[PDB]
Amino acid sequence: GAMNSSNYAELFNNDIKLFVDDTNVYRVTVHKTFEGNVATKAINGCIFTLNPKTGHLFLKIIHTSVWAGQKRLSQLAKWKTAEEVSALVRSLPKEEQPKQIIVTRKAMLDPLEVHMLDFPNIAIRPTELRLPFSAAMSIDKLSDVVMKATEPQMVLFNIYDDWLDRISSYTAFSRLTLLLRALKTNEESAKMILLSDPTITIKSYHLWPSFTDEQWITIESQMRDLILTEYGRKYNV
Amino acid sequence: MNTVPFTSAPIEVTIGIDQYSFNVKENQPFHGIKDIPIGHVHVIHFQHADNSSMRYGYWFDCRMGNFYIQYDPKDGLYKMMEERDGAKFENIVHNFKERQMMVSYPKIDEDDTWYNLTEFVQMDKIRKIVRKDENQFSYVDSSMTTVQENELSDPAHSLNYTVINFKSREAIRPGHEMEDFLDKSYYLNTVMLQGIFKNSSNYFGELQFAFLNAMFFGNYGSSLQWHAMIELICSSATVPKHMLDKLDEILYYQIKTLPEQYSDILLNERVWNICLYSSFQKNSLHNTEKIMENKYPELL
Numbered sequence: 001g002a003m004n005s006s007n008y009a010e011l012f013n014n015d016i017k018l019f020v021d022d023t024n025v026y027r028v029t030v031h032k033t034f035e036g037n038v039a040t041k042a043i044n045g046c047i048f049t050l051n052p053k054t055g056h057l058f059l060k061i062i063h064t065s066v067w068a069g070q071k072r073l074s075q076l077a078k079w080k081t082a083e084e085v086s087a088l089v090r091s092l093p094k095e096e097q098p099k100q101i102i103v104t105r106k107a108m109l110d111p112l113e114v115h116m117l118d119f120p121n122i123a124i125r126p127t128e129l130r131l132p133f134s135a136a137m138s139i140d141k142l143s144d145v146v147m148k149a150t151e152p153q154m155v156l157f158n159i160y161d162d163w164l165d166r167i168s169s170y171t172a173f174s175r176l177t178l179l180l181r182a183l184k185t186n187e188e189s190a191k192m193i194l195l196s197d198p199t200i201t202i203k204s205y206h207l208w209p210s211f212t213d214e215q216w217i218t219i220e221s222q223m224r225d226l227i228l229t230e231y232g233r234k235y236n237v
Numbered sequence: 238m239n240t241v242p243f244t245s246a247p248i249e250v251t252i253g254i255d256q257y258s259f260n261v262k263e264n265q266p267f268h269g270i271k272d273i274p275i276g277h278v279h280v281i282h283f284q285h286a287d288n289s290s291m292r293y294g295y296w297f298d299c300r301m302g303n304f305y306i307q308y309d310p311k312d313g314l315y316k317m318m319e320e321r322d323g324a325k326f327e328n329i330v331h332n333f334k335e336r337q338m339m340v341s342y343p344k345i346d347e348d349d350t351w352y353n354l355t356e357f358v359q360m361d362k363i364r365k366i367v368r369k370d371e372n373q374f375s376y377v378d379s380s381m382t383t384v385q386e387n388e389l390s391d392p393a394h395s396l397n398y399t400v401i402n403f404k405s406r407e408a409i410r411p412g413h414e415m416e417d418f419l420d421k422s423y424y425l426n427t428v429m430l431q432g433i434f435k436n437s438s439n440y441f442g443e444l445q446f447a448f449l450n451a452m453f454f455g456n457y458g459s460s461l462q463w464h465a466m467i468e469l470i471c472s473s474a475t476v477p478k479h480m481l482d483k484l485d486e487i488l489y490y491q492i493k494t495l496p497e498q499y500s501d502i503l504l505n506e507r508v509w510n511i512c513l514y515s516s517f518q519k520n521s522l523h524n525t526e527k528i529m530e531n532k533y534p535e536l537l
């Protein structure tokens with residue numbers, strides 16, 4: 001059934017699973033036309049498919065050409081997501097295929113279920129968590145590869161960098177969701193926190209800076225403050 | 238006109254014949270039902286006074302034999318049976334009519350209700366849904382489950398309706414997932430009409446038979462099947478024009494005949510609101526939509 005607080009540690013057991021987030025697949029800017037009407041212009045998107053135990057991120061880049069001449073694009077985006085997830089699963093060896101796929105939005109359940117009818121033993125599940133994966137495009141290197149793409153492309157990233165060498169996947173997921181929640185609530189402040197100290201760099205093959213354990217506790221503390229604050233500035237408390 | 242005689246009425250029972258029903262008291266001198274219109278299927282059904290649980294009954298066609306009812310005190314129900322000795326049967330019936338111990342099938346001359354409910358229902362197709370080949374008539378009751386229900390437990394006593402499942406490989410062509418799931422025309426016209434049912438008459442017959450089992454026996458899997466067959470048509474962008482016109486008539490008379498107080502259980506809000514207001518065929522069911530909105534505006 002649905003994924004929620006009560007079954008949160010299932011994510012870190014040894015049954016292969018993937019989160020699928022479609023919130024960045026179909027992206028538009030809205031603008032005025034010369035006649036003073038409103039029009040949209042699509043920009044490149046991405047499917048965010050993440051193994052929470054390993055940190056594996058299969059980032060499928062959705063190039064704007066996929067929308068050309070299509071109607072009802074927000075509905076098509078869910079089926080395009082489903083088609084690409086299904087294609088990914090079919091491309092993996094049997095022992096790498098997931099046993100469950102968890103969609104972050106319930107409107108993906110039927111599209112994914114239909115595309116995965118060939119895989120009756122893969123559970124398609126919703127979740128009651130309000131996970132912050134939409135903020136993935138606030139990670140500079142991920143935004144960069146999406147916006148530069150001139151064709152459809154799959155790019156393979158570890159979203160935990162090398163963290164699992166030192167911490168567990170439960171702790172790594174908690175750090176990731178905290179960083180992303182911060183970036184979603186106030187991107188500028190979050191990014192200021194992450195970079196203010198020039199001496200801490202981001203390795204060429206990493207997404208996040210190379211903090212020591214002690215520096216990560218400071219950072220994590222600053223991100224919590226931000227989220228509680230912005231919750232202040234937002235609700236006046 | 239044909240006759241279904243009763244040996245006796247040992248237990249108090251409400252007896253239904255088609256859409257008619259009457260009360261028989263324990264050991265009342267009731268010996269059956271006469272003037273039954275030839276040319277239609279019929280159903281005779283029962284609800285015991287003592288146990289309103291288990292409505293049950295028999296689908297039959299008088300052209301296919303001489304049938305009578307006889308209570309069985311061991312199994313505790315009114316059983317339909319065939320009399321093969323035709324001279325014996327005529328004599329029995331003639332005696333019962335002379336003593337006027339039969340109720341008359343009370344069809345009003347203006348009235349086409351039963352015809353309109355059973356237009357496409359054939360006894361030969363009923364017998365393929367209800368498998369009991371040694372008898373010419375078919376037993377149904379409230380509790381019988383459908384083949385699809387058993388997939389989700391006694392097979393000999395199942396209702397073998399055509400399985401319809403919108404999220405199945407049968408319904409969805411590889412490569413047309415979004416297309417086939419949002420516009421079920423392939424599934425309706427190629428898979429079901431051309432492939433399984435062969436023509437829309439056989440389709441409509443199963444649909445009408447499912448509705449009637451739902452209404453007369455409160456058979457829940459029948460109700461599921463009726464709604465599924467409606468939804469498949471309404472969710473298809475491409476339906477023959479004659480099928481839509483006939484569907485509208487079919488549904489009109491089902492809704493007209495439904496007991497006003499059973500609407501809450503026998504009508505699925507989601508299917509009906511989708512079919513009348515959202516589906517491809519939202520504008521094609523004029524009679525059904527008008528009677529739905531004037532009789533059950535709460536459901537909508």
Ligand SMILES: c1ccc(N2CCNCC2)cc1
Nearest residue numbers: 055056057058155156157158
């Ligand atoms: C999907 C599968 C594998 C990876 N990586 C590649 C880099 N090394 C760790 C594993 C990423 C996404």
